[PDB]
């Protein structure tokens, strides 16, 4: 029963680990793409 | 029953690993190609 408890706690910890890591990438992308879209307007102002 | 949970622990880790692999691959690639657009237009300003 100790082996069943240990495996269940680690398995639940893997789900909580993935939730913390996966939330970063998707949200960072929306900020990064908007940062380079804003940079287009800055560079093109000096280009003309 | 102990080893059945151990197998499900590794299985749960596999499904969550593959999910975070796909997210970070698309987000990093699209941001990297966007940074090249800024670099291209900046160099074009220096030439002229």
Curated annotation (Swiss-Prot), chains A, B:
Top-level division of the source organism's lineage: Viruses
Intrachain disulfide bonds: none
Subcellular location: Virion
SUBUNIT field: Homododecamer. Interacts with the terminase large subunit; this interaction allows the packaging of viral DNA. Interacts (via C-terminus) with the head-to-tail adapter protein gp4; this interaction participates in the head completion. Interacts with the scaffolding protein; this interaction initiates procapsid assembly, thereby ensuring incorporation of only one portal ring per capsid. Interacts with the capsid protein.
Role, per record: Forms the portal vertex of the capsid. This portal plays critical roles in head assembly, genome packaging, neck/tail attachment, and genome ejection. Procapsid assembly may initiate with a nucleation complex composed of portal and scaffolding proteins. The portal protein multimerizes as a single ring-shaped homododecamer arranged around a central channel. Switches upon genome packaging from an asymmetrical conformation in the procapsid (PC-portal) to a symmetrical ring in the mature capsid (MV-portal). This change of conformation may serve as a signal for headful packaging.
Family label: Belongs to the p22likevirus portal protein family.
Protein name: Portal protein
Record organism: Salmonella phage P22
